[PDB]
Design a binder for this molecule. Structure first.
Ligand SMILES: Nc1ncnc2c1ncn2[C@@H]1O[C@H](COP(=O)(O)OP(=O)(O)OP(=O)(O)O)[C@@H](O)[C@H]1O
Length: 372
């Protein structure tokens, strides 16, 4: 049991501690400014940004990274670790191989129609389900990319206090996007979550902050086959302020953490929007799918498989993925500035919600089993 589940984080140490440990990497990534932007939105949910110096081609400028959380420290750490994760993903001429000994079938990654399957640059990764090395396309690992195999994305990029922690987060993200992808294909999302029985009072606190600012919040269950809670927080802003509909999605072994991460996601999208009208018929479509519901469950009804131990958590996931024919769980260590940072790749997991050009022929069948 190496996980401190205090308040709203599920990490090996407190966010305060993490913030302390990362100061040097913060200087290495060239951070200019770390600003709280909680009071940009009427909801008063902690959201931060980090700006950092970045040179593209020859032109220097600024890159921004947001962070979210149920308290200030979490959100500040979140923006920092978000920034480190991104910096660490750049492209590393020393991690690339040209004649791979063990190349993955690129087809398994789910390829767009325009995919250049003639992959020149590979990267050695570790399949932790099969305890083997496996070579994966650089396009699947780094960000940003040329986009030859597929359009570059950040799905599966995570940083963390140690490697396992980074791996767990990235795995939960992959699961989240896969489940959301299936949700995107469903005609209706029928099951509402009633959060009243939450042991963690931060859930009630976050709903209230939404209600008091005139934002209705509805929680929907998007959990897939793996019994790893995936939750959508659907927000409708009925105030004078210019935002309306949001939707943020959270995933975790603990259903309550999934819920919190969904709530804080909405918070982050709102603030990043604010740092800057749906036609009837579309609104009607959105109402029927995202707002209406058939059934309602309690948090108590949802699976909870968190064992508050990284090894036990990963074991559970590895086994669950494996059980359901998702037979590889691949990571690539992307540490650059002395903080843990990974790419996780789980072949066959959908990414459609992030890249509409990528959808496998298995998605339909999975949608029918899970929904109708
Ligand atoms: N307390 C923490 N300790 C170590 N790493 C953290 C901590 N909080 C966040 N991170 C890392 O920073 C990155 C951003 O985390 P966060 O949960 O805010 O965003 P996310 O889950 O990527 O969702 P989104 O970016 O869509 O808002 C992730 O790589 C995460 O693992």
């Amino acid at each position: 049991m190496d996980i401190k589940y205090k308040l709203a984080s599920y990490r090996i140490c407190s966010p305060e501690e993490t913030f302390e440990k990362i100061q040097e990497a913060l200087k290495k990534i060239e951070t200019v400014e770390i600003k709280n932007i909680q009071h940009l939105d009427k909801v008063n949910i902690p959201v931060y940004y980090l700006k950092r110096r970045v040179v593209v081609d020859g032109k220097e400028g600024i890159a921004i990274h947001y962070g979210k959380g149920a308290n200030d420290i979490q959100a500040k750490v979140s923006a920092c670790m978000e920034a480190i994760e991104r910096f660490s993903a750049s492209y590393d001429k020393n991690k690339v191989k040209e004649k791979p000994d063990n190349p993955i079938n690129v087809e398994d990654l789910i390829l767009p129609q325009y995919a250049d399957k003639n992959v020149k640059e590979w990267v050695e990764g570790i399949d932790i389900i099969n305890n083997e090395t496996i070579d994966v396309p650089a396009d699947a690992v780094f960000y940003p990319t040329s986009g030859k195999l597929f359009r570059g994305n950040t799905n599966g990029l995570a940083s963390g206090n140690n490697l396992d922690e980074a791996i767990l987060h990235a795995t939960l993200e992959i699961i989240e996007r896969d489940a959301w992808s299936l949700a995107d294909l469903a005609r209706k999302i029928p099951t509402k979550i009633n959060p009243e029985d939450a042991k963690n009072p931060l859930i009630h606190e976050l709903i209230e902050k939404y209600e008091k600012a005139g934002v209705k919040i509805i929680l929907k269950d998007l959990t897939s086959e793996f019994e790893i809670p995936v939750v959508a927080a659907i927000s409708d802003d009925l105030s004078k302020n210019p935002l309306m509909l949001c939707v943020g999605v959270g995933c975790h072994l603990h259903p309550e953490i999934a819920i919190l991460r969904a709530l804080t996601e909405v918070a982050q999208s709102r603030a990043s929007q604010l740092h800057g009208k749906i036609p009837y018929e579309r609104l009607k479509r959105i109402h029927r799918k995202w707002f209406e519901f058939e059934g309602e469950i309690n948090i108590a009804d949802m699976p909870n498989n968190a064992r508050y131990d990284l090894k036990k958590d990963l074991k559970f996931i590895k086994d669950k993925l494996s059980e359901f024919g998702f037979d590889k769980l691949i990571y690539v260590d992307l540490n650059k500035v002395g903080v843990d940072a990974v790419r996780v790749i789980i072949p066959k997991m959908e990414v459609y919600t992030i890249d509409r050009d990528r959808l496998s022929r298995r998605a339909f069948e999975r949608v029918k089993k899970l929904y109708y």
